[PDB]
Design a protein around this ligand. Structure first.
Ligand SMILES: O=c1ccn([C@H]2C[C@H](O)[C@@H](COP(=O)(O)O)O2)c(=O)[nH]1
Ligand SMILES: O=c1ccn([C@H]2C[C@H](O)[C@@H](COP(=O)(O)O)O2)c(=O)[nH]1
Ligand SMILES: O=c1ccn([C@H]2C[C@H](O)[C@@H](COP(=O)(O)O)O2)c(=O)[nH]1
Ligand code: NI
Ligand code: NI
Lengths: 169, 169, 169
């Protein structure tokens, strides 16, 4: 079959988008407005549920814009088949806590947020607005064979017990 | 074929598990007991060898629990076909070194470890116990065609030389 | 078809390599010489363009050597089909800014760079040389079905609305 089922869990949820046939995955939006201070960790709720069929895995991963411009680090989530719960974005503000203060929050593009009401924030703080495009979902097929414990392998390769950790060549 | 070969390299090794037909990959366990101080890097040995056939790649990656609860960051390892050596978990404790001390170690769930014997640790330190479930392996098929150097591409797309780095839209 | 088209954008560009039939992906080289101070972010240009066909995605990802030896963190780039622009390596030097000074730069293998001309650098600084092998590209097939909004899913699974965030079991 060529259909994926999507359940919206609230009015704050936004439907994933795949504009262009050339695009790899689906744009994921935040359903929460959240301020992340330097070094702070959170799981941002999308209020979106997905039904991935067997033989596939979803990759809830970062986008080039947010990750390259800001210190907001998204850990790629392995969305298993059958998981019909709320998709959470595993995020960390990886800006260092330098103990310095500023009156400007930063957006998901590293642009300064101008406010009428003046407030003091810790330098390196970000704000993710409700409805903002911060992640993407890329679904790839998986191979899940039966495991067999062996003492030696059937086919000896030309790479072998090497080579973990090779820099400089 | 629908079989994957697994070699245990020591008695400390633990067999990877795929409970449920709905699960994406295989649970990987640590074979070492290791204390990671803030900002410390290590390669944790599993004492497990795997024989991935050609046309596939293994993804030695994080789990939602450990990564969301703790500052333990696992870099996804690309397990090549033919690599029959020890699978190492590329890990870093990404807690900041604030120079502060505590008498509590943190486990892989960010819970405080209570000890009868009192010791002073640096705040943000974690302990990975031998046998603990800290990673997972997801095997996906790969496309490895022959490369052809061109001056211009055959099919001009509608995405084009764009678009790297787009935030805010 | 079993062919991938590659365009070199400058003389500084280097052709991706896939030595051995056992290897997962293609070795990517830097086209820039760049010094990254602690906590600094950059997008390193490869001056290499690729034409990935539809039904596939490229994974511009780290290698075991650089990532395990150094604090240089590469965020895996999702190279979409049709993207014919310059492939950029999304990188961050994740060494902490301890305010300390040294006369040695570190290479991509964490080895000290010896210089005839003496200079003062911030401790934790790295230098990526033009032509150095720092990344790899692994191409995997993608599933991109049509989306259908539902109120409830057709097939209820045995995993269910669980289980996000499970450590310690
Ligand atoms: O960033 C993430 C990671 C995981 N999950 C969901 C999907 C998985 O099916 C489930 C369990 O994750 P693991 O513990 O298997 O990583 O949690 C998310 O929603 N977001
Ligand atoms: O986290 C990792 C990364 C790599 N490898 C193994 C599998 C690869 O076949 C080999 C070489 O890795 P690269 O240098 O190709 O990344 O090291 C691991 O065991 N764990
Ligand atoms: O590290 C990266 C990430 C992305 N891209 C390119 C490929 C994508 O087609 C395009 C858009 O990226 P996203 O915004 O979709 O992540 O930028 C890179 O060259 N390097
Ligand atoms: Ni990944
Ligand atoms: Ni950090």
């Amino acid at each position: 079959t060529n259909t994926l089922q999507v359940k919206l869990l609230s009015k704050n949820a936004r439907m994933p988008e795949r504009n262009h046939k050339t695009d790899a995955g689906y744009d994921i939006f935040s359903a929460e407005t959240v301020v992340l201070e330097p070094q702070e960790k959170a799981v941002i709720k999308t209020d979106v549920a997905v039904s991935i069929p067997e033989g596939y895995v979803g990759l809830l991963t970062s986008r080039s814009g947010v990750s390259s411009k800001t210190h907001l680090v998204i850990e790629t989530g392995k969305i298993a088949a059958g998981y019909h719960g709320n998709l959470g974005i595993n995020i960390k503000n990886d800006h260092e806590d330098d103990k310095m203060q500023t009156i400007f929050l930063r957006n998901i593009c590293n642009e300064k947020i101008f406010e009428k009401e003046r407030h003091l924030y810790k330098l390196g703080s970000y704000r993710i607005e409700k409805g903002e495009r911060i992640a993407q979902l890329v679904i790839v097929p998986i191979w899940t064979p039966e495991l067999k414990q062996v003492e030696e392998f059937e086919s000896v390769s030309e790479r072998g017990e090497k080579g973990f950790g090779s820099c400089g060549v």
